[PDB]
Design a protein around this nucleic acid. Structure first.
Lengths: 92, 64, 125, 106, 101, 52, 70, 78
RNA sequence: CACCAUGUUCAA
RNA sequence: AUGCUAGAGCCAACAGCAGGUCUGUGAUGCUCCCAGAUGUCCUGGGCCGCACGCGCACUACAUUGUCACAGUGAAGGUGUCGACAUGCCCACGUGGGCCCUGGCCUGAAGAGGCUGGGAAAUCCUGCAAGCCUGUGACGUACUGGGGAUAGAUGGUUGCAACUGUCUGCCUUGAACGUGGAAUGCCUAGUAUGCCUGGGUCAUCAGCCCAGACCGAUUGUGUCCCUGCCAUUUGUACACACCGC
RNA sequence: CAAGGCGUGGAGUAUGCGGCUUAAUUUGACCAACGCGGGGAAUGUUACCAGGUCAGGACGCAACUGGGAUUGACAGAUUGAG
């Protein structure tokens, strides 16, 4: 996929902060709340979903991705995050 | 049908940082290629020793 | 040569803001719009080729897709291979081509010379 | 302002239609029957009506908070602008959709 | 006592008349010099698509319509009084907007 | 290489259905941006009714 | 005679640059000149003229039929 | 192309002595006077017929009855 | 009570 | 107020057609391609290309008319990123503009500038629609009918106008003189005529979907033609008479 | 159909279809196809043709490989093409 390390890190920071991620199907844009291209977000979430760290839905023109337990564990391991922090989905 | 265009692959030049610095036990390390001057940190980056140019790549800048 | 009562001397020693007024409506609007990078690049390349082949021959054939482009006095005498979509037809740019585009001198279809109508050309078949 | 009345109401309809389509793809294994949208001050409430609220809500509201977040971030809602709710469909036999998906999964 | 315009609009005449009657009842509960529901001509949004997903058959046409009903109410009331009578919960689908000058 | 999706214009190649993503026969009448094929599936949920 | 210039028949006349009202067979003489100028160079419009086709972009599929059933 | 399926009228374009004096003499005694009746009775242009109707009505040898875009009815004065 | 002949092979 | 089901429509059962659509879909099974791609993007071209046959529509063949001036005088509607703009431009690290446009000014027009309104029963807009009516010119002549074709060249939309997007101005002035065999639609605010709005649309409407306006001739039946429904009847048909 | 009205068939164009030409003139459809695919395509639309890019080949396995797997690029050529 050949994503820059800072793009990987930003997408993972967002996906872990909010336990969910949304991405328009349009690949040639950049989506808000990120400086990362929608194409890069989609090509990363294909990998996460195939590894099983993300549940993927596609309704009209949008992808909705939901973190899994394996996904929060892997993102902890990757972003080096303490067990103190859990996604905003788990905050309550 | 015409021939196929090759995909460009890097030359795989081994150990370039060695030919970068000439080390002197008499004095100390001499750097063969000039560094590149920029407000963005290019003090460690080197320009290419082109026959007619000096070309910094991290910035994309060329002397003649 | 007398294009609009202005020989090549005046036409080349002119202004593009005055080419605007000597050219027709569509070229004038295309110039009012500030013609683009690829057109300026092709003009630069034509200067290159005319300086490359100067006295004892004709300039080399410069290949372009720019059928969009107007012909101007600065372009007179050059050999431009205009694209159809299949081949680069070489075009020696004369003086009576000014204002027109390059797509008017590169043709995109082979003239139609018909054959036998064959089945289904009527209602008797 | 910012929108005609014609365009505001047609856009409300398109918004409801996208909501419904997403939700019927997302909650099909769970008895999703319908959705109501109530634009109220302080909150655009969205009431999901499903057969099995026990599983339209996740492990400790996990799934419904997922859906709330993802709707916020899809439709660009001002934070604290939408709240999703589930409620058992009163009959489950008067819902063609809820029975169509039942027969589907059988 | 300040001039107020409550504009209501809906794709549901039943749910619109319910809320307009509710607001008139509230504005007369402590009479606020109400001028009753001015009925703006209903907006018919007509969309006439072709039935078939492919160009085969007699060209038929589905004629859909969306009727948008709009009712005005005029008051001479204080801000929080009118916002109270408005905040008594409004039916779904009805879009209510208040203007003061 | 940043000529990838750099077609300069805007038109019936950028107007894609908000559901299908298909550019053929879209209904952009009220900002609807549907395609005439998906509108006949969605209409009742938008609020359009077939009266006459 | 105070007839304005936007009223005239040749309004800029390439090869001359002058504005004149071509009249009484200099009309088709100038038409022949303008077709000669456009057929000397291989301008598409001059080519259409010389092949006897419909210049200025019509559809020559079913309209310029001109008899000749086959 | 295959085709699947009136001698000309030479009407005087300008007046002459005989036809003009005949217009003066005879026509003001017609029951119905119209562009067409004048043109057929004198073999004269329709515009000359309109001119004649106007002149004769002006200087009194004919009175209008129903003048309009369609048939311009005049009649003999008395 | 003018005249009104015909419809390739398997498949349904 | 009225009396074909009041008019007009919407919805419309059961069985089917091997009717159309896999090119509407993140509808889809099997199958093919899959990096020198049948993915995708970009440039150019093509889809429009013309010895011909056809469907269909627009314009006509003129005086119940064409042009010129003027008058009277609709209805449905649409309209300013809530996907685009996460852009481009003017202005000044930031505002305004992008849709429908009024009024004023420049120009012969096309059109362009200045300045305002409208997220609209509020502004465009009482859309001062065309047909129509009044007058004048034309005078039966392929004609001031017809306006196809073509020439020089001024705007506009657009990143881009060549194979002319549309459009201004002068010029050019074709066939067509009511159309063979044949054939379509139609029963009252209907046919026809005449324009208007919306869809498509950055620009292109001779198209479609609707809207009014002017407004009838005939018929109020029949089963002759072409077919439909029902009963009776015959049959060697059942893929069902395009049968055997 | 009868009584009839407006016509269509003849003319010129607009457009769809067949045919022919073409690098390609993408293509479906033949009462119930032919201003129909809301298909009025300058370009993206596009499916067709001449070229040229990019991978947007997940995930797994093996190989290579921080005594560098790979990426991006100035300039001169090349290219239609900064």
């Amino acid at each position: 996929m050949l994503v820059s390390k800072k793009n990987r890190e930003e997408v993972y920071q967002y996906l872990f902060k909010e336990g969910v991620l949304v991405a328009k199907k349009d690949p040639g844009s950049k989506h808000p709340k990120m400086d990362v291209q929608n194409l890069v977000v989609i090509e990363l979430m294909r990998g996460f979903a195939s590894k099983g760290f993300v549940k993927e839905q596609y309704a009209w023109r949008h992808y909705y991705w939901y973190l899994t337990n394996e996904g929060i564990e892997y993102l902890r391991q990757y972003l080096h995050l303490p067990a103190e922090i859990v996604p905003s989905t788990l905050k309550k | 049908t015409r021939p196929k265009k090759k995909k460009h692959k890097k030359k795989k030049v081994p150990l370039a940082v060695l030919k970068f610095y000439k080390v002197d036990d008499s004095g100390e390390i001499t750097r063969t290629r000039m560094e590149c001057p920029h407000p963005d940190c290019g003090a460690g980056v080197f320009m290419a020793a082109h026959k007619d140019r000096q070309y910094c790549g991290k910035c994309g800048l060329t002397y003649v | 040569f007398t294009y609009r009562g202005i020989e090549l001397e005046g036409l080349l020693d002119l202004s593009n803001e005055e080419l605007a007024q000597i050219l027709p409506k569509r070229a004038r609007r295309k110039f009012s719009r500030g013609l683009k990078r690829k057109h300026m690049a092709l003009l630069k390349k034509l200067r290159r080729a005319k300086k490359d082949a100067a006295l004892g021959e004709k300039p080399p054939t410069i290949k372009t897709h720019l059928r969009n482009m107007v012909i101007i006095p600065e372009m007179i005498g050059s050999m431009i291979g205009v694209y159809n979509g299949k081949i680069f037809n070489a075009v020696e740019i004369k003086g009576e081509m000014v204002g027109h585009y390059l797509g008017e001198f590169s043709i995109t279809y082979r003239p139609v010379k018909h054959g036998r109508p064959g089945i289904g050309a009527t209602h008797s078949s | 302002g910012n929108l005609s009345k014609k365009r505001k109401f047609v856009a409300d309809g398109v918004f409801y239609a996208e909501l419904n389509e997403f939700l019927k793809r997302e909650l099909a294994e769970d008895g999703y029957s319908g959705v109501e949208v109530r634009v109220t001050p302080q909150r655009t409430e969205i009431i999901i009506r499903a057969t099995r609220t026990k599983e339209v809500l996740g492990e400790k509201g996990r799934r419904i908070r997922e859906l709330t977040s993802v709707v916020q971030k899809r439709f660009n809602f001002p934070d604290n602008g939408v709240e999703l709710y589930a409620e058992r469909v009163a009959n489950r036999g008067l819902s063609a959709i809820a029975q169509a998906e039942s027969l589907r999964y059988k | 006592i300040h001039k107020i315009r409550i504009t209501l609009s809906s794709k549901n005449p039943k749910a619109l008349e319910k809320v307009c009657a509710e607001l008139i009842k509230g504005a007369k509960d402590h009479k606020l010099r109400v001028r009753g529901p001015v009925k703006i001509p209903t907006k018919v949004l007509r969309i006439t698509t072709r039935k078939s997903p492919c160009g085969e058959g007699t060209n038929t046409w589905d004629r859909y319509q969306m009727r948008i009903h709009k009712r005005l109410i005029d008051l001479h009331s204080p801000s929080e009084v009118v916002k109270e009578i408005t905040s008594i919960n409004i039916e779904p689908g009805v879009e209510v907007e208040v203007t003061v000058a | 290489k940043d000529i990838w999706r750099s077609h300069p214009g805007r038109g019936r190649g950028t107007r894609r259905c908000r559901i299908s993503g298909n550019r053929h026969g879209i209904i952009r009448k009220y900002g609807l941006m549907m395609t005439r094929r998906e509108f006949r599936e969605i209409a009742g949920d938008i609020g359009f009714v077939k009266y006459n | 005679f105070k007839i304005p210039e936007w009223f005239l028949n040749r309004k800029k006349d390439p090869k001359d640059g002058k504005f004149s009202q071509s009249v009484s067979n200099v009309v088709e003489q100038k038409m022949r000149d303008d077709l000669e100028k456009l057929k000397k160079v291989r301008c598409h419009r001059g080519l259409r003229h010389m092949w006897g086709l419909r210049v200025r972009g019509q559809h020559t599929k079913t309209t310029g039929r001109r008899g000749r059933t086959v | 192309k295959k085709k699947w399926s009136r001698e000309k009228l030479h009407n005087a374009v300008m007046w002459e002595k005989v036809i003009r004096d005949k217009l003066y003499s005879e026509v003001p005694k017609y029951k119905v006077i119209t562009v067409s009746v004048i043109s057929d009775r004198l073999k004269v242009n329709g515009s000359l017929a309109r001119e004649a109707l106007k002149v004769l009505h002006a200087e009194g040898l004919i009175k209008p009855v129903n003048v309009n875009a369609n048939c311009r009815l005049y009649t003999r004065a008395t």
